[PDB]
Structures are given as structure tokens and as C-alpha cells.
Structure 1
Amino acid sequence: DTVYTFPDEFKLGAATASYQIEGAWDENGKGPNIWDTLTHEHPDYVVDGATGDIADDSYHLYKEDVKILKELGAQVYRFSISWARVLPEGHDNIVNQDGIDYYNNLINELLANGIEPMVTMYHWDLPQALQDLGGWPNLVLAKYSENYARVLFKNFGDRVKLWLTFNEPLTFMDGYASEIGMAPSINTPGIGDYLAAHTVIHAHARIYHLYDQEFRAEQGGKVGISLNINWCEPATNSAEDRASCENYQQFNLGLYAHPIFTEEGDYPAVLKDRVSRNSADEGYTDSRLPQFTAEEVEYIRGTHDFLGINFYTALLGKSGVEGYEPSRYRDSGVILTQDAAWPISASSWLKVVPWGFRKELNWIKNEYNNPPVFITENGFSDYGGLNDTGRVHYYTEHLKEMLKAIHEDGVNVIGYTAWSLMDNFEWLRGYSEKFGIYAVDFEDPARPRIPKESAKVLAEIMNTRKIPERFRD
């Protein structure tokens, strides 16, 4: 049963994000963020015209969140901090004590209940005052991000020892690649999304160096980043289809991980070269991909204590090019599809492909020299229901695959937090797609959290530290 047992030091828990759960969007001095703006001004972008104005009301109900974490037996709770709740103006001139108090209250409640906090600094909720300067495409945000992080380390770092600078910049950069999509819903594909990535990488590096310089000696924690990546399986066994899948990994994960996690640093060569060529062919004087200087390459490489991975699904990749000119997908040189045979979820993008998780973990091991990997998200959507057999099976299969990666393949996976502790505001999908292991009644002002079967099974896994016999192959 070795392949079915978690390593003794491995950390298990669950995850949320601030805008998705907190509500209290303008309470007690909190400033507006880009998701307040999107859901208020553009309800036509969101299923049901839903907003995060209340969500799970975790601003008021944080003790209930801790209660269900304790019931689950979580060792770690991954949550994010709302930048505009702490710094309502985005800049560090005004610190909102109500926000400081709130996160201290949550942290202290967690620790009093034997649960370790893991904090994501940025999970998509940029202060609107900073978006008004251009947001992530404007490199001035890297210093603003450093200053935000300093406030977080100063106030919380005596008790928080696990930090993620950013969550899914591959996703939030896409808020600069569509007029109707992710906040801030700006249509600069192939140009502004790359600028956003560039700023984020710079920001991440500044935050890491800040920790080294101002906090690490006293606080003794670890700083990483959470990167999402889909497995990309060759549509056929050809060398050409394999090349396309390598392109996919480099254009999705490598975009962020090559600058940070390799000895060489910088963007992947294929990313630089394909965008350079495409830009020239379209008549641009300058490549659409921003450049790092040698000094910047050296500053950015090595800025990590672990790699956070968000894993959900797989795609099929074949040789070719598609998408609009200009765009990151077109630049990436792969044609992406889904296999009809893969089980479905309530989310168009998410098919159940558990073996893809093991393949991805091996790809990461080989590319980045087996970094410590913390799975910061993994989970499954349905439309509702407590007898969530699909979710149960998603978890048991993904955990089995991860355990094979650890035990059979030697991948240094160090922790895992299920997405999500409870049903929450699923971005443009509103409350229509359910990812929780706890259900939440969004028509009940008290927002009760109630366990699904998946919460019961995960509790059993966390308690026994193994995959139960009935779920084994």
C-alpha cells in the first residue's frame, strides 16, 4: 500500500480566493477592484449577471470557514488577500486597519485550530486605481506590487510561512486579450497580455528579493508562485505532434517558469523565436514579446522556494497554427482539441483526464530539475448536489495519479490543496458552476456551508493519510 500512502510531511488541505468568497466588497474602507468594476458595469459578461458583492460572505463568516476546515482535517488553508481591502488606493499611502484586522483574525483563528495559513498575495483582484494606470501591462505595477507585499510580510509574516506571489498569471493576463472576458476585459491580444506577463514576472522577482532582504531571516518562510498548466497530449505519436505539445508547455507554463525556475532564466527560446518571427512577418518594427536585459534575467532567475501548480485537465495537441493574428494561441504553434471520450464536467474547458496529471508532474520534474511542487489547486465542477460522485472520483483518481508521481516517478510533491473548500463565485460563470467540497446556499443570507460526499471522502483521506481500499485500482 506504499503507492497509496501520503509521505509523512506532505500537507493536505483546501483553497479559496478573496473575491470568490469574501463579499463585503465596499465594507469598512475596502476600495474597489477590477472585479467590482466588471460585475457592476458589465453584468452581461457574467452568467446570471452574478456579482461577488456577497459571495460566501467570508468577510463576516470566516470562523465558519475555519470550522469546516477543522471538520475536514485540513493541515493547510490556502486563501488570498484582497489588495484593495488592505490598500484601498492601491498605493501604500493608506493602510486599511479593518483589512489588517480581518486577515489577522482569520490567521489567528486558523492557527488556534491547528491549521496552517498559505497566502496568495494576488488572485486577480487588482485595485481599480492601479488598473486606471493601465494595470498589468504598465511596468510601474512591479514596484507597487513590492510595496503591497511589504505590508503583507510586515503585518502577517510572523505567522504566515507559506506565500504565493501570484495565482495563474497565464489566466489573468488574458484579461488583456478580450473585450468581454476576465477583468479588466481589455482587447489587446498578442500585445497587452504579453506586457502583463512581463510586469508580473518582474513583480514576482521584486517580491522574492524583498522577502530575502527585509523578512526571511526573522520569519523563516517560503515564497513561491501558483502557475496553472494543462497537460497537452500528442494527438498522434508523430514527432510533429510531439513538437506541438512541447510548444504548448513552453507557451503556457514556460512563459512564467522558464524565467524563474531554470538556471538559464529568460523566456523559453521557442517563445522568443516564434513571436519574433511572427511580428516581423506582420510588419512590426519590434517584436510583440517584451525583452529582459541580461541583468534582469539574472535578477529574476532563482526567485523561488517552491513551485505552486494548479492542475485541472488535459488537451490534445497537433502540429499546426490557429487562432487570430495576433494572439498567444496563434503564436504558440499548436492546434488544441479535447477527446470526446473524456468524461465531462459542468465547465466546457474541464475534462477528466487523471493520467494527464502524472504526465504533467513528470514534465515539470524534467524541465525544472525536480523542484518542490505544491499542488495549490485541483478540482471539479458540477451544477449542484451533495451526492457528488463525479467529484469524489475526480479526487480519488487525481490523488492516485499524484501518489504514483511521488512514489513511482520520484517527483517532489510537497502538498495539495483542493479547489475549493466551498462553492463560490466562479468568475464569469457566476454561481452556476460549483467547485466546492462544501455546498453553500446562495439564497440563504446566512450562507450555510454543508459537506458534500467529496468533503467526507477527503476527510477520510486526510485522516487516514491513504487512499481508501475501495478507491484503489
Structure 2
Amino acid sequence: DTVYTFPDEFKLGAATASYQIEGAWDENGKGPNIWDTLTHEHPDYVVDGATGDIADDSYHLYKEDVKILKELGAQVYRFSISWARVLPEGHDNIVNQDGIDYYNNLINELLANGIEPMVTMYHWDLPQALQDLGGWPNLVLAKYSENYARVLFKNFGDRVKLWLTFNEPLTFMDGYASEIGMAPSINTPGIGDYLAAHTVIHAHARIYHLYDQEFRAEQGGKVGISLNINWCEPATNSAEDRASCENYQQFNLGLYAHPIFTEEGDYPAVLKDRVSRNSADEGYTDSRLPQFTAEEVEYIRGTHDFLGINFYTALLGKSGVEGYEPSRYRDSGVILTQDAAWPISASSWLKVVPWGFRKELNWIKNEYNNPPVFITENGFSDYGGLNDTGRVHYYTEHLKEMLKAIHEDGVNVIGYTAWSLMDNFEWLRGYSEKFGIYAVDFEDPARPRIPKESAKVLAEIMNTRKIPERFRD
């Protein structure tokens, strides 16, 4: 039963994000963010015209969140801080004491209940005042991000020892690649999304160096970043299809992880080279991919204490090129599909491919020299219901695959937080797609959280520190 047992030091818990759960979008001095803007000005972009104005009301109900975390037996709670709740103007001239108090109250409540906080600084909710300068494509945001992090480290770092600078820049960069998509819903594919990535990488590095310079000696914590990646399985066993899947890994994970997690640093060569060639062929004087100087490469590489991974699903990849010119997908040189045989979810993009998790963990181990990996998200959507057998099966299979990666393959996985503690605002899908292990009634002003079968099974896993026999192969 070794392969079914969690290592003694391994941390298990659950995860949320600020805009998805908090509500109180304009309460007690909080400034507006790009998701306030999207859901207020462009309800046509969101299922049901939903907003995060109330969501789970975790701004008011944070003690209820801690209660269910304690019931679950979570060792760690991953949550994010709302930038505009703390710095309503984005810049650090005004610090909102209400925001400071709120996150202190949550942190203190967690610790009093024996649950460790893990804090994501940026989970997609950029202050609108910073978007008005251009947002992530504008490199000035790297210094603004440093200043925001300083406020967080100063106020919370005495009690928070696990930090993630960013969540899924691969996803939020796409807010600069569509007029109707993720906030801020700007249509600059193949140009502005790359600029956003570049700024994020710079920002991450500044934040890490800040921690080293101003806080680490005193606080003794760890700073990472949460990167999402799908497994990409070759459609056939050919060398050509394998090449396309390597392209996928480099264009999705490597975009962020090669600069930070390798000894060499910089973007992956294939990323630089394919974008350079495509840009030339299309008549640009300059490559659409921004460049790091040698000094920047050195500054950025090594800025990590662990790697956060969000893992959900897999794709098939075959040799070829498709997508619009210009775009990151077209530049990446892979044709992506899903296998019809894979079990479905309530999300078009999410198919159940648990063995892909093990493959991805091995890819990461080999590419980045077995960094400590914390699984900061993994989970499954349905449309509702407490007898969530699909979600239970999703978790038990993915945890089994992860445990094989640890025990059989030697991957240094150090923790795992399920996405999500509770049903919440699922971005452009509104409240229509449910990812929680606790259900929430969004028509009940009290927003009660009630356990699904998956919450019960995860509690059993957390308590026993093993995969129960009935879920074993």
C-alpha cells in the first residue's frame, strides 16, 4: 500500500481565488478591478450575465470557509488577495486598512484552527487604474507589482510562509488575445499577450528578489508561482507528432518556466525561433516576441523556491500549424484535439485523462531537474448535485496518478490543494459550472456551504493519509 500512501510531510488542502468567492466588490474602500469592469460593462461575455458582486460572500463569511476547511481536515488553504481591496488605486500611495484587516482576520482564523495559509498575490483581478495604463502589456506594471508585494510581505509575512506571485499567466495573458474573452477583453493576439507574459515574468522576478532582500531572513517562507499546463499526447507515435507535443509544452509551460526554472533562463529556443521566423515571414521589422537582455536573463533565472502547478486535463497533438495569424496557438506549431473517448465534464475544455497528470509530472521532472512541485489546483466540473460521483472519481484517479509519480517515478511533489473548496464564480461561465467540493446555494442570501460526496471522500483521504481500498485498481 506504499504507492497509495501520502508522504508524511506532504500537505493536503483546498483552494479558492478572491474574485471568485469574496463579493463585497465595492465595500469599505475596495477599488474596482478588471473583473468588476467586465461583468458590469460586458454581461454579454458571461453566462447568465453573472457577476462576482456577491459570489460566495467570503468577505463576510470567511469564518464559514474556515469551518468547512476544518471539517475537511485541510492542512493548507490556498486563497488569493484582491489587489484593489488592499491598494484601491493600484499604486501603493493608499493602503486600505479594511483590506489589511480582512486578510489578517482570515489568516488569524486559519492559524487558530490549525490550517496553514498559502497566498496567491495575483489571481486575475488587476486594479482598473492599472489596466488604464495598458495593463500587463505595459512593463511599468512590474514595479507596481513589486510595490504591491511589499505591502503583502510587510503586513502578512510574519504569518504566511507560502506565497505564489501569479496564478496562470498562460491563461490571463489571453485577456489580451480576444475582444470577448477573459478580462480585460482586448484583441491583441500574438502581440499583446506576449507583452503581458514578459511583464509578468519581470514582475515575478522583482517580487522574488524583493523577498530575498527585504523579508526572507526574518520571515523564512517560500515564494513560487502557479503555472497551468495540459498534458499533450502525441496523436500517433511518430517523431513528428512527438515534436508537436514538445512544442506545446514549451509554448504553454516553457514560456514561463524556462526563464525561471532552468539554469540557462530565457524563453525556450523553439519559442524565440518560431516567433522570429513567423514575424519575418509576415513582414514585421521586429519579432513579435519581446526579448530579455543577458542581464535580465540572469536576474530572472533562479527566482523560485518551488513550482506551483495547476493541472486539469490533456489534449492530443499532431504535427502541423493552425490558428489565426498572428496568435500564440499558430506560432506554437501543433494541431490540438480531444479524444472523443475521454470522459467529459461540464466544461468544454476539461476531459478526464488522469494518466496525463503522471506524464506531465514526469515531463516537468525531466525538464526542470525535479523541482519541488506543489499542485495548487486540480478539480472537475459538473452542473450541480451533491452525489458527485464524477468528481469523486476524478479526484481518486488523479491522486492515484500523482502518488505513482511520487513513489514510482521519484517526482518531488510536496503538496496538493483541490480546486475548489466551494462552488464559486467560474469566470466567463458565471455560476453555471460547478467546481466545488462544497455546494453553495447562490439564490440563498446566506450562501450556505454544504458538503458533496467529494468533500466526504477527500476528508477521508486527508484523515487516513491514503487512497481508500475501494478506489484502488
* Deviation sequence 1:86-134 (CA, Å, 0-9, x none): 0000000000000000000000000000000000000000000000000
SS in 1 for 2:172: helix
> Is 2:122 the partner of 1:122?
yes
Aligned partners of 1:347 and 1:471: how far apart in 2? 24
Question: Alpha-carbon deviations, 1:270-304, whole Å to 9, x = none?
Answer: 00000000000000000000000000000000000
1:224-249 alpha-carbon deviations (Å, 9 max, x no partner): 00000000000000000000000000
Structure 1 residue 156: Cα displacement: 0.0
| Distance (whole Å) between structure 2 residues aligned to residue 309 and residue 177 of structure 1 | 23
Give the 3-state SS of the residue equivalent to 1:444 in structure 2: coil
Paired residue for 2:307? 307
TM-superposed CA distance for 1:250, in Å, is 0.0
1:229 and 1:18 mapped to 2: Cα distance?
22
**3-state secondary structure, aligned to 2:111:** helix
Deviation at 1:8, TM superposition (A): 0.1
Q: What secondary structure sits across from 1:253 in the alignment?
A: helix
Structure 2: unaligned runs, 5 residues or longer: none
Q: Deviations over 1:42-86 (max 9, x none)?
A: 000000000000000000000000000000000000000000000
Structure 1 stretches of at least 4 aligned residues deviating more than 3 Å after TM superposition: none
The Cα offsets for residues 154-174 of structure 1, whole Å up to 9 and x where unpaired, read as 000000000000000000000
CA–CA distance in 1 between the matches of 2:388 and 2:245?
A: 33
> Distance between the aligned counterparts of 1:273 and 1:294, measured in 2?
17
- Partner SS state of residue 163, structure 1: strand
Structure 1 residue 425 displacement after superposition: 0.0
The root-mean-square deviation of aligned C-alpha atoms, in Å, is 0.1
Map residues 233-312 of structure 1 onto 2, 5 A cutoff.
233-312=233-312
Q: Distance in 1 between matches of 2:288 and 2:444?
A: 49
Instruction: Write the distance in 1 (CA, Å) between the matches of 2:319 and 2:428.
Output: 31
Cα distance in structure 1, aligned partners of 2:186 and 2:111: 40
1:40 Cα deviation from its structure 2 partner: 0.0
- Inter-partner Cα distance in structure 2 for 1:205 and 1:23: 30
SS of match in other structure, 2:249: helix
The alpha carbon displacement at 1:142 in A equals: 0.1
Aligned to 2:418: 418
C-alpha distance in structure 1 between counterparts of 2:115 and 2:441, whole Å: 25
Superposed displacement of residue 402, structure 1:
0.0
Name the structure 2 match of 1:372.
372
Separation of aligned partners in 1, 2:313 and 2:248 = 14
Gaps of 5+ in 1: none
Task: Supply the distance in 2 between the matched residues of 1:288 and 1:161 (Cα, whole angstroms).
Answer: 38
Q: Secondary structure at 2:137's aligned position in 1?
A: coil
Distance of 1:450 and 1:378 partners within structure 2: 20
Once the 2 structures are TM-superposed, how far is the Cα of residue 438 of structure 1 from its aligned partner?
0.1
Alpha-carbon separation, structure 2, partners of 1:469 and 1:24: 43
How far the C-alpha of 1:2 sits from its partner, in A, is: 0.1
Residue-pair matches, total: 473
Query: TM-score w.r.t. structure 2 length?
Result: 1.00
Deviation at 1:463, TM superposition (A): 0.1
Distance (Å, rounded) in 2 between the aligned partners of 1:381 and 1:357? 17
What is the SS of the residue equivalent to 1:254? Answer: helix
How far did residue 209 of structure 1 move?
0.0
**Distance in 2 between residues matched to 1:337 and 1:321, nearest whole Å:** 13
Distance 2:391 2:171 in 1: 23
1:32-431 aligned within 5 A: 32-431=32-431
Whole-Å separation in 2 of the counterparts to 1:23 and 1:448: 15
In structure 2, what is the Cα distance between the partners aligned to 1:453 and 1:148? 39
Counterparts of 1:341 and 1:114 in 2: how far apart (Å)?
A: 43
Q: Structure 1, residues 347-392: CA drift from partner, whole Å, max 9, x if none?
A: 0000000000000000000000000000000000000000000000
Instruction: Quote the Cα distance in structure 1 between the aligned partners of 2:92 and 2:37.
Output: 21
CA distance in 1, matches of 2:391, 2:195: 37
